[model samples]
Target: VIGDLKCTTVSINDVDTGAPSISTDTVDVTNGLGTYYVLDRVYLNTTLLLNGYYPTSGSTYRNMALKGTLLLSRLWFKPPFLSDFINGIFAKVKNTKVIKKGVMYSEFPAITIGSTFVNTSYSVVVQPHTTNLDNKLQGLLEISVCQYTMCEYPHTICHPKLGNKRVELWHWDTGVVSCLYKRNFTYDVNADYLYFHFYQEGGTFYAYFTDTGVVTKFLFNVYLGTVLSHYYVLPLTCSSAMTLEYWVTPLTSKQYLLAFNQDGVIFNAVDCKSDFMSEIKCKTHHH
Candidate 1:
């Protein structure tokens, strides 16, 4: 509306401004004179939008962040004629150009900072990967961008030592994990964003990451100690600095089959601002 520039709230966090605020505490407990185990009965914030730079804001895309890979991986990755059809008709219909900085391209033949179908490449955040966990809870949130010294991500990372591997390691990033308050996240991707639906089930936290073609489910293999946010590699090792090999496969009743059988390496969660905390990556500071 502002001089030929059109903006859509589709990308922003879907906040129920008119609705009553639900309980942030997703823990299930028995209430007065009740035999029912209360489930997390609330409207989940449906903002599959990527980074919420606002820190405390709920699900909403501040700007244009189209993370197609997150969605197409299952629906559009290798589903036959749908790939180009998707990338094509989508381009012609919506006809959105590449998003650079905070601006969506207004030019035709849509241009982006990078590739046309590189699902994992496009990110709306300024850089380094940023997310917000302050909205649901207070005090524990801050305005800090997560950055790491060494990380292997967007795929193509496998350990030579492990062999038969496709390790997806990346900069550990997050500010919302503590012994006192840790949130489990459900990984789901949509049109313009990759979402982490964080909730609480007992004390164990979970976050699954997905890539193109094959939608792989990664387990923290972490035996979360007491509470906090970080997980102890079910190897029961909060062990770090050392190149600890972990597994990322399906979870079964025998979840404790602690096998070093090389599957894939899940990047250890990073709390970028952990300079004063107890994670090994303290060597890298948030510049």
Candidate 2:
């Protein structure tokens, strides 16, 4: 019985139209074979049925049956637009996966924007059902150059560590740091004169700057590490809109240098001139 063969018929139907859409066809199969292949289309009314007989044991025949319904559409039938719309809604629903001996993971597509101070646009697709941090999204804000003007100022000489090193006495309005004699020096803005002193014996440094009549003091030591370089933005008390930017650098293992610059400073007629000079004379004065 294992090699014995037989023929069968298969059909299909459209239940809503009460019409057969599939026809009968002869198919081949062998004994002990548990599968059947249908090679042609068949039409039917309401239901599809496959009726056949198989020989078993000696020669007795037994019946095999299969049945199913049909779904159909006519040219005049207009399917609901919302059917595809609802399908799209479910299509966006995402599913996360869990890995064996590991954590759950998911991935989503995203759009990125640049950080430059220029006009740009970005778009993002969000799924409402997902777990997003803070229940929100984020963005960045960059200040444009049109909001501020760039300005450059001069260096100064006012550090206590210069011990007899000939100091410079350049006019602040000249926008240059010129030496009165050959020596090392520090620099700062006219409105806020800054001074620093480094102690080699213990690797300690002190910073001092004057704002109006008040003196602000700062000290650094080995605990704060070497004073390789530093900078500060100091607001001017004389003018609400004016501010000073001071920078410092190390000249050697034992010496430090300072300079000054500013932004958004509105120069008056008296301070804005080619010949204007604000000079500070300097010599060895112990403090």
lDDT of 2 by residue, 67-149 (tens): 11111122101111001110001011011121222322221111111111111211011111122235322221111111111
Determine the backbone clash count of candidate 1.
13
Q: Which candidate is the best by TM-score?
A: 1
| Residue runs of model 2 more than 4 Å from their true location after superposition | 1-192, 197-239, 243-249, 254-287
lDDT for each residue of candidate 1 in 1-287, tens digit (9 for 90 to 100): 00111112222232222311233432110110001111232212211111111111121111111121111121111112111110000010011223334333211011111112222222111111112233221111111111222121121211122122222322233553222222333322112222121211343433322222121233232232323221111100110112211111111111000111133222112222213331233333322
lDDT of 2: 0.17
Candidate 2 C-alpha error for residue 194, in Å: 3.1
CA RMSD, predictions in order: 24.3, 45.5
Using Cα atoms with residue i matched to residue i, what is each candidate's TM-score against the true structure?
A: 0.18, 0.14
The whole-model C-alpha lDDT of candidate 1 against the native structure comes to 0.19
- Residue 218 miss distance in model 1 (angstroms): 1.0
